[PDB]
Amino acid sequence: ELIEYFKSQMKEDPDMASAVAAIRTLLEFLKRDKGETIQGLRANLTSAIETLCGVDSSVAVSSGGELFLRFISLASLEYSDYSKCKKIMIERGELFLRRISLSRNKIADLCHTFIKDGATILTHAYSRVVLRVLEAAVAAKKRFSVYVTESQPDLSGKKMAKALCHLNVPVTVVLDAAVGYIMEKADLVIVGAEGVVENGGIINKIGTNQMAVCAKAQNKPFYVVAESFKFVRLFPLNQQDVPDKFKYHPWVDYTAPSLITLLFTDLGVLTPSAVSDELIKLYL
């Protein structure tokens, strides 16, 4: 209907993530909902999340939808009036949006310390989180070089290099097949994530997993920068266990937590063993 129009118009901010826009659309449609019962609202918003992930096939949209449903259930467990409960839901959603829209800056502030002077950083594709981290690092009078792969499916590496050149940072574009070649000249690898699975692994661009192995074979540190709304309760046993709704040439793949050193979220610097703890404490 018109929910897709609003969701696609909310993505006029180039810095706004897809999951953030989906959550904003869900909150707007919860505000404008004329329902008088909690079950009808839950069902309508569930079908709306279904439509949203039908429009955008990213894992972040599904993660945000599940987080919104869990927040709805948590707010409904308390008051049980659906009027005062609705006001509480509205104010809590406002506060949650205001707190989650500034998580990238906090991630950058807490992650930019791990970058030394004169080190070499390896990135896979274009991501706003790595860009903000590198900007916060170069703002602290740090000097380093950046290697970025081209990400052949959609040339996001050239876009990342063009965005980094405006920051006066030496950047070099390498091919996807030359990952194992420049791995010895890189001091650390920093990648983003589209979704963090239960065990601790990530779900990212197709050329990420093969880069986490080549780093593990050389004891290179491998850091993942991702927000908190990307925590999804999924457990892929292998590359085939990933749902086809997210992969569709595959557009995404899974990386095991044993190849990940640290995660930098708005909750802080965590190990791959903390995502499962957070998901269990949330009772999603």
Partner 1 sequence: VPTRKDYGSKVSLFSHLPQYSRQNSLTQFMSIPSSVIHPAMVRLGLQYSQGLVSGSNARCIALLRALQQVIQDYTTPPNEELSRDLVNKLKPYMSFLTQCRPLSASMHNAIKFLNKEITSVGSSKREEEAKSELRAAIDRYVQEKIVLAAQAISRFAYQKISNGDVILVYGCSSLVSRILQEAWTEGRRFRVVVVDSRPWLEGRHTLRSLVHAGVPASYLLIPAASYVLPEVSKVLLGAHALLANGSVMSRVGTAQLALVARAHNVPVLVCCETYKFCERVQTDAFVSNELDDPDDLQCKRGEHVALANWQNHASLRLLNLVYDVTPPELVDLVITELGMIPCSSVPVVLRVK
Partner 2 sequence: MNSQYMFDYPAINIDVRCHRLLSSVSYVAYNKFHTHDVSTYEHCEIPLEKLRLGFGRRNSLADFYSLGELPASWGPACYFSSVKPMMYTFQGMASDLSRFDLTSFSRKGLPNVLKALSWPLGIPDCEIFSICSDRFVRGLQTRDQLMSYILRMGDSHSLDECIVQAHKKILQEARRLGLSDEHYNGYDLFREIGSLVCLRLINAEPFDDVRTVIRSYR
- Give the interface with partner 2 as residue ranges (CB under 8 A): 1, 35-40, 42-44, 46-48, 50-51, 66, 69-70, 73, 76-77, 233, 283-284
Residue 216 contacts residue 205 (beta carbons within 8 Å): no
Q: Which of 153, 243 has the CB closer to partner 1?
A: 243
Q: CB under 8 Å to 201, separation ≥6 — which residues?
A: 236, 254, 255, 256, 257, 260, 272
Distance set, CA 157 to CA 137, 140, 147, 154, 175 (Å) = 20, 24, 9, 8, 9
Residue 104 contacts residue 132 (beta carbons within 8 Å): yes
Tell which one of 65, 192, 195, 257 touches partner 1 (CB under 8 A).
257
Q: Smallest distance, Å, CB 130 to partner 1? A: 26
Q: Which of 219, 238 has the CB closer to partner 1?
A: 238
Q: Does residue 2 belong to the site contacting partner 1 (CB under 8 A)?
A: no
Q: Does residue 237 belong to the site contacting partner 1 (CB under 8 A)?
A: yes
Q: Which of 88, 262 has the CB closer to partner 1?
A: 262
Q: Does residue 80 belong to the site contacting partner 1 (CB under 8 A)?
A: no
Q: Applying CB under 8 A, what is the total number of residues that bind partner 1?
A: 15
Tell which one of 44, 57, 145, 199 touches partner 1 (CB under 8 A).
199
- 251-280 burial: b if 16+ Cβ within 10 Å, else e: ebbbbbbebbbebbbbbeebebeebbebbe
Q: Does residue 276 belong to the site contacting partner 1 (CB under 8 A)?
A: yes
Provide the token pair at 7: 């969701």
Tell which one of 166, 238, 244, 249 touches partner 1 (CB under 8 A).
238
* Strand-pair category, 171-174 with 202-204: unpaired
Choose the stretch contacting partner 1; rule: CB under 8 A; options: 135-143, 144-152, 207-215, 269-277.
269-277
The Cα 261–Cα 269 span in angstroms is: 10
The Cα 41–Cα 158 span in angstroms is: 44
Given the rule CB under 8 A, which residues bind partner 1?
198-200, 233, 235, 237-238, 257-258, 272-273, 276-277, 280-281
